[PDB]
């Protein structure tokens, strides 16, 4: 079913190889809440947009992930796109 996991991947898949790479790293830039931390090192250049999404969604949950994912795209000068993510509800 995964609607956010679907909306998420539908967008992460549009991230060009350069954005995909940055996406992984730029995830370890946005500050995280207390019990939350950065994305494990070996989890960056190992997980594909699928597992990278699962790891993101699984680690941050579909709800906060989307929030985390959104702000990242926004950082990559993708304000309008991330907006489409916010509609994934």
Swiss-Prot record:
- Supply the Pfam families for this chain: PYRIN
Q: Cite a GO CC annotation.
A: cytosol
This protein is called: Pyrin domain-containing protein 1
Q: Which keywords accompany this UniProt record?
A: Cytoplasm, Phosphoprotein, Signal transduction inhibitor
Q: What top-level branch of life does the organism fall under? A: Eukaryota
Which SMART domains does this entry report, sorted A to Z? PYRIN
Which Gene3D superfamilies does this chain map to? Answer: Death Domain, Fas (1.10.533.10)
